[model samples]
Target: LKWPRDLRPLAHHDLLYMGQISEEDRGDFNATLRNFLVPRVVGSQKHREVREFIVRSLKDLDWDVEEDCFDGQTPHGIKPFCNVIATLNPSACHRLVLACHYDSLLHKEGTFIGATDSAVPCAQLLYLARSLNGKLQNQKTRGDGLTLQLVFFDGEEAFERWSSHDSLYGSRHLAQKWHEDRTSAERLESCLERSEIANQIDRMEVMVLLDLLGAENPRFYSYFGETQPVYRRLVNIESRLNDAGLMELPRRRRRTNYFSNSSTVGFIEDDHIPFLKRSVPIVHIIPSPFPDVWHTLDDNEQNLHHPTISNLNKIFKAFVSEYLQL
Candidate 1:
């Protein structure tokens, strides 16, 4: 019921609207950011508002939205947390996941909004869903067999200090749940007779996690050799958008590209860890040093650069459009 019964790929001309985000698209981005710009610490009132808003927004777009709710034991106390997962076509056997943590860090002072720490990335994902909703449907109808899944993870931040037990509560639970399940909760009904896939984790084509973005001149690099080609595709998309004048930011400045060509060995501890442990290929779009305002009260709307955010949106539009073959 969530996915249309007779979905098909959209026409080439139908997707041309995504070539450049229109003024309305920019407004949608702003509205999403505005709604998410709050102290969304787990169990807090703002957290619930943002979670409900995300579910409502995606459901309005006609995506299958699931709220994975659970009580997490934290350094402070037991806290109820929820992860919002939205899928464009749940019946599709393969999925490309775009994810970001929706919860802000629980600072001692309790004033952190985490605008660039993840609020922007959250907004970016919502923008993608809203802008490409129909195109994704078309891709589904055409039988590309790849669906888009948006994950807004909760409790990615630590309650005390950064530790394995304290951080990644939502993702750790969801990843383990998916790995343990034999089939998807919303698996293709017709494939029930021919189902061979072991679990939901195996259905993931790639899980791209975005963090500490929405800042000006952010840097991303290839971290895993296996997914290096996917990372390079993002680089290529950035370049193409810049060359085509769709991106506001220049492609290169003094030979500094937004995406570095060199691959790094070190990996950041993030929500992707649990899935990665289950052998899910990941593209972690987080900066090495992280943003200057990370973990501070300064990580609020005052520091976000609109042009930089717009450029990133354009790059992602091209990247995902190509991947889903819209």
Candidate 2:
């Protein structure tokens, strides 16, 4: 089952796994590259084009999808936006969520293409969905009872500057909705008596947000004062990458003297902050020393490295396969 707005086709109307991009598809990929790697700030035409592409791609894969539209306010005022959710079995008790924000920053100089910042992760999610759709079909025989939710968020980028009050409009809305859902019962009597019980559902098992993944020799640093379990999961992912001969240490510039301090290790303020405030376990995949092209007109296809994309996809796939099983 795919949540609304999360649509991708699996094959060329043949119901086959599209799998990885093949040599023959390079032309189509290039065309998509030209279209997708253009400046796409929220509410812009390019942004809507990318969003539509993502939705259509997911739909082609045969997943159930849903869209959540909300009224969001920046410090200045209110604007309307949407979040796309694609789910595989929402009713399943066990759940896992994989998410990435689709909006690019609205820089003063000009809009950014954000190819590595997010389009790569978006593609990776599509690949994983294709892979998992097959595994999910054999659940009874495989004895795997888990639900996977893929969320494509909007408005993650800041309006003018990166400040607490100026960013993460989409996630904040979702978090608040989750909070309200737990505390407010549709039935008045039940709502009055069980509001406290509803608050607990805000704690999701795990939330992983991906960004800045299309670069050469990418490194995933631990962020957000992650606990032991989360650290272990990240370490496990790194270890798996090492085993596959794809691990790369963070560049010296990206490391700090207090790297051992959990609180300060990888303290980034990305879209995951909203979920973190709700006490949900969150992991952010960001390339350290952020690329030179970040937030500039130069942040386009020339900056993307295919090797890094492939490596990140492998690590993400391994981590999800292990973590979701638990």
Candidate 3:
């Protein structure tokens, strides 16, 4: 049971899970990032390719994938936003949701390839899917709590200007749909007893929304007080990975600590808002001061830091594997 100091202690199955995670081919992350480094804004032809890329990659991993496509209309106009949900071990009652926006913003600044904004997060999720390939296949029989669900949301950015109604269009649609699906909670006796949605809604661990990742010295924080523990665990995992010399080498902050005070920032408006409204815990993996290129044409492959992406990649793999364990 011996492990590194910074990593939270390993329990049963943790060691093996870490081993499986370590064996993942990280090269795919780069490839996917490259593929998505285009202006895949809503209504654009390239946007379709971005959606298809995610679904095809999920299918390639032999995972169950579904799509929620709809037209999100506002004062700005109407556009299509598709949400990609890929399930690993779909039958598991408890689930871990990892989400990232795939659509770039509609901008006249230049080619708006949202590399750090979310392309990195999408590729990281793909990496995790490939990492857990064997484990998910085996979970067909075993009743494990770690059912990983990867969500790729479109139209995360506002069509024109940022506003409560205009932004997070895809998430708003899906969250409302999931809420209105009464069939899931309808079993007569199963309901009315002590069941809100027949208590079916309590199974989600939390939605870890990744944005603005894979950049050097990127700062993350626990916006909500309830999810601070989850945030702390991630920083600790990064610390341990650094100790093992398995983390990417970055200058300036050699201690491997990365996080901020829970109250350092306020509630962020992102894909998790709708889910949070429905009483879901959230781990918002977005940085404080956004990447220098954020929302601009410069937010492309050229601006991303190799060491940052590599380091966060390891930390995410570690934190996710451990969380699924205990």
Candidate 4:
């Protein structure tokens, strides 16, 4: 198998699991959040810095990084945007995309950090990239033919009011870009079995998107029937983690579970919509009845609960390990 020039080859013995979340792990997560907690609106200096930060962090893990740069007309004006794509194995035919929007809204009054709205989610993705680097490498070496891709989208929030034309600038652009992409499938054909997939968009097995998280006692429902089985796995992963005492307990013991058994035909508007419209299976991991401080000044570090974040991190670590069989 071909390896990216910068990726360091790892011995089989060096591969290990992303273990239990520890103080240092939490410290790293917090540090990532601190770096991203600044007001990073699209086209701003801080926004450029944050995008570079994400690209640098992923490149440090030895992943193939691509910046999809473009300009989109917004309610305010034409804004430049870039979507960060970091892949574990670019040659792999099948991909499991883990995505989150990195840009915060343009608030007219004060600085909006959007901690739960998405900064925490981006930090969570970074945590997984750091912790699972070795394991992901192991999977690649074993020729599983499946790979992980992390997408950090810019210009997710609307500069003015949220509307079809004003929102989801990054994802809309990327989904269309991938849909029209004709180069990857032909390049991959020589190395693997002939695939019927037409373009880059069709190679995606599932896209798991995280949003409006980091608050305590967040609950998720099965939104799409096609991905309900995978959602069940998350539910079971949470149960197993709790049974083994690996998860942190909530401050107030509640009878409700983090994952609900019910399914909802309706879904929230987020970064996944573009891919969803293009027929990619989606596991939208957003909580219902969003954080009380959603889109407000109160949605800052003070409202973020580390225990909840740590627990979700543990759950995601286990879920990805099981999903990729690493």
TM-score of 4: 0.90
lDDT of 2 at 203: 28
Kindly list the per-residue Cα lDDT of model 1 for residues 1-326, writing each as its tens digit.
Answer: 12211233324443344457778888989998899898888888888999999999999998999999999889998999899999988887778899999999888876888999799999999988887777777776765456889999998999888898989999999999899978752554333233356798877768999999977787788988768778877776666555555666454432226788788778689999999999888999998778888888899898998888887787787778777777
Q: Which scores greater on TM-score, model 3 or model 4?
A: 4
Clashing pairs in model 4, backbone N/Cα/C closer than 3 A: none
Residue 30 CA error for candidate 4 (Å)? 1.1
lDDT of each: 0.81, 0.61, 0.73, 0.82
Residue by residue across 216-268, what tens digits does model 2's lDDT show? Answer: 76555566554445545556554434534343335422321211223335467
TM-score for candidate 1: 0.89
Tens-digit lDDT track of model 4 for 1-326? 22111122222222223336677888888998898888899989999999999999999988999999998888777889999999988888778789999999888878888999799999999989888888788887766567899999888888888999999999999999999997555566222354457789977778999999999889889998888777887887777666556667754343337888889767588999999999898999999889998999888999998888888887788778877776
Model 2 residue runs over 4 Å out of place are 1-35, 75-77, 140-145, 183-203, 224-227, 244-266
Ranked candidates (TM-score, high to low): 4, 1, 3, 2
lDDT (C-alpha) at residue 288 in model 4? 88
Clashing pairs for predicted structure model 1, backbone only: 7-141, 8-138, 8-141, 8-142, 9-138, 9-141, 9-142, 10-138
lDDT of 3 by residue, 1-326 (tens): 22112334545355334523232355666766787877787888898988998999999988889899988677577777799988876656556789999988878766777888788898889877776577556654455434778889878888767899889998988888777655343442222233244243454557899998867787777787777667777766766665555655545446555565444656678999988998877888888878877777777788888767777776777676676543
Model 3's C-alpha root-mean-square deviation from the true structure amounts to 5.0
Top candidate when judged by lDDT against the true structure: 4
